[PDB]
Structures are given as C-alpha cells and as structure tokens.
C-alpha cells in the first residue's frame, strides 16, 4: 500500500430487501446509517436488490414461472373439449 | 527441353566442382538398382529421359525412386563475345556423380522386366553403368 495513489475504501455494510448480509466492503460511501458492533461501524447504502437469493439460483432454481404446459394446449383447451 | 527438376537457389554462380572418388550408398528401398562406375556430371534432361524409358517398358507403375537430383547451377557465354568481363548468364543444372554411387532403384516386378528396364535406361547416360540387387543384411527389414 503506497500513498496518495489509491482511492477511497471502507468496510461498507451490504444489505437487501432481506438477509442483512452485512459484512463486506466497497468504495461507495455517504450517509452513515449502521455504526454497529456485530458488523463494521459503516453504511448500508448498499441496498442491492439481489440477496444472492433473488435470482433463484443460489437459492436453487425455483418454479418462478411456467412456461410448462404446451401439450395441454391441444390436449386441454379442446382437450377438456375432448373428454 | 523438358524441365525434370530444379530448386530455389539462394546463390547463382557456383565455382565449378572437382570430382575425385567415392564408395558406398548401397541399395535403399527397391530390389534392383543401377550403379554408375565413372566420374561425370549428369544434366537435368538425361535423368528425365531415363525415367521415361524406365516407365514405358515397365507397366502398372512398380516402385521407382529417382535417387539423385540436380542441385548445382550452370552458366555460359554467347558466341561472338571476347573473353573478359563477368561470368555469363546461368542456364541449366547438374549434379555430379562419382563412381560407386547408385542412381535408380526399382522393385515390384520379376527380374526380366527389371533388367529390361534397367538396360533401356543405361543408354541415356554418359556413365558406364552396372546392375546390382538389394542384397543382404543381418536383418533384411
């Protein structure tokens, strides 16, 4: 680490609509809101909308949409009409 | 006037040779081969005519390798030019053959075809040729 040639950085709290994953750092700062012990006396300005759970991939693939029923189209729309 | 073989040179005027003697270079691949027994050059054409007169009285191909190739270049002046100024233009090619060397080699046909062809060929070269076969080893392979 040299001097005067490295930008700002602080252990800014990360957060989201859930999960309070308040441990990481960053380089964007501002209005102080979380000076707390359990984490860094820092900022939750990072209110990213991805918990690493929004995209159901780290929470595993969900059934968020289907997008599954093409066969019943002929087999239910006039297939309810069938039987 | 047909061009059998040539090269890519890197040099044009080469000092004319000096041929002394040789021994070795026995049969390599085929079963029947020539053997020049003198000291002389050999032009491009002579080898070409030899290859033709071997192919024709052969048939169905039969393995035939041309175990020599012109490398060195040639030169000449024009008639009516007094001696003097720098070397003349280059025209031709030549690869000198000492005695003992082996020019051609064949296999794939019984001797009668072989000696037929390899006596037809030896009338196109200024060398006193001979005839030898692929002889013997500790392992023929």
């Amino acid at each position: 680490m040299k001097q005067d040639i490295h930008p700002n950085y602080q252990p800014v709290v990360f957060m989201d609509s859930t999960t309070g994953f308040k441990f990481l750092s960053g380089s964007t700062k501002g209005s102080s809101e979380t000076v707390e012990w359990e984490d860094g006396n820092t900022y939750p300005l990072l209110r990213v909308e991805v918990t690493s759970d929004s995209h159901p991939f780290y929470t595993g693939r969900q059934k968020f949409t289907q997008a599954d029923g093409r066969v019943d189209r002929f087999n239910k729309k006039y297939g309810l009409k069938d039987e | 006037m047909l061009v059998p073989k040539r090269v890519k040179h890197r040099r044009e005027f080469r000092g004319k040779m000096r041929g002394e003697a040789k021994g070795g270079k026995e049969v390599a691949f085929g079963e029947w081969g020539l053997q020049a027994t003198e000291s002389h050059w050999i032009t491009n054409r002579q080898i070409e005519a030899a290859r033709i007169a071997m192919t024709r009285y052969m048939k169905r191909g039969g393995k035939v390798w041309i175990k020599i190739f012109p490398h060195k270049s040639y030169t000449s002046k024009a008639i009516g030019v007094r001696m003097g100024k720098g070397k003349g233009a280059p025209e031709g090619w030549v690869s000198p053959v000492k005695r003992g060397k082996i020019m051609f080699e064949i296999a794939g046909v019984p001797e009668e075809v072989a000696r037929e062809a390899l006596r037809l060929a030896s009338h196109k070269l200024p060398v006193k040729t001979k005839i030898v076969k692929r002889e013997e080893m500790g392992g023929e392979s």
Binding site: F23, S27, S52, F57 | -
Partner: protein
C-alpha cells in the same frame, strides 16, 4: 474477513477428507487475482483509458498499471510504447472481499443467467470468468459509465488437477451450471 474464517473452518477439513492428504500443507489454496481491461482503442483514440483506469479504480481498490505495446503491428496500427491495457493484481484480504462481492452481489446482476461455464480447466486449474459489460457492480452508475468494456479475471490456485479446484470453488461460491 468472513471468508478466511469460513475458509479455515470448513474448507480445509472437507478437502482434507475428499482426497486424504498426508499433510494439511497439501491443501489447494487461492493465490492471487489479476484483472485485465484491454482498451484496444488508444492507438485509435487515447481518450478511453482515461476512463477505463477510473472505472477500474472504482471496481478494485487501487489504481491499475498501464501495459505497454511490446511490439509493432500494422493491421492493428500498433507501435511499441503505446498503451493498450491496464491491470491490477489482488492479494491479501482484498482477494476475499472482492470474491465475496463477485459471488454474492456482482454475478447475480447479469441477465439471463445460467452460471459460469464449466470449462476453464487449463489442465492445471486457473479458472477465468470473462465478462461482457461493466455496469454490473454497484460501484458503477448509470449516467457516469458510457461504454461496454470488459475485464478478464484470472484466478489462480495451488491445485494440480481441475476437479480439486472445481469442488474447492464450489465450497466458495462459484454458482456453476
């Protein structure tokens, strides 16, 4: 950081199991991370690194270097001494901070996601993760970033084969497919 904790408390015993090292020293680690922002346009317009290096300083925590030209190419119009690319190396805790960023916030900001390609083995395990854009990280803003450059993350390990590295990175994020 939390990773180092999680690392020395979970990764070491699990991996010591899955291969039975005669010594814990035999562990496959993570060594460094290098970042590669190739402008490729300074020869045309040298007024692009002027912002590339800035966006970098924002992504990492340090100002990048500036790689030279090293040779001369006409179809490219390359003369030696010209700058084309700018890099940073990550070590120490910042490694883990930035990798936490990647696995936890950065990666899941990319549209139409399936995960990382399963094939960056190199037969020696230094997996890379190409990126198209640079609008991903929250350290970057809409009306301030006016290009679509990319980087080439080159993570390195101490593994010899690729399965060790794969199932290691599995323990440390890397949402594969």
């Amino acid at each position: 950081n939390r990773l180092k904790e999680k690392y020395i408390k979970e990764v070491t015993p699990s991996l010591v199991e899955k291969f039975n090292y005669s010594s814990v020293m035999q562990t496959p680690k993570v060594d460094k991370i290098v970042i590669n922002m190739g402008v490729g346009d300074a020869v045309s317009n040298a007024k692009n690194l002027d912002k590339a290096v800035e966006e970098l300083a924002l992504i990492t925590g340090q100002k990048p270097l500036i790689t030279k030209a090293k040779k001369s190419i006409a179809g490219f119009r390359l003369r030696e001494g010209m700058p084309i690319g700018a890099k940073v190396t990550l070590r120490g805790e910042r490694m883990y901070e930035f990798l936490d960023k990647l696995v936890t916030v950065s990666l899941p900001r990319v549209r139409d996601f399936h995960g990382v390609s399963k094939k960056a083995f190199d037969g020696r395990g230094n997996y890379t993760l190409g990126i198209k854009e640079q609008l991903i990280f929250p350290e970057v803003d809409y009306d301030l970033v006016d290009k679509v450059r990319g980087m080439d993350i080159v993570i390195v390990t101490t593994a010899n084969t690729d399965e060790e590295s794969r199932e290691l990175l599995a323990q440390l994020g890397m949402p594969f497919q």
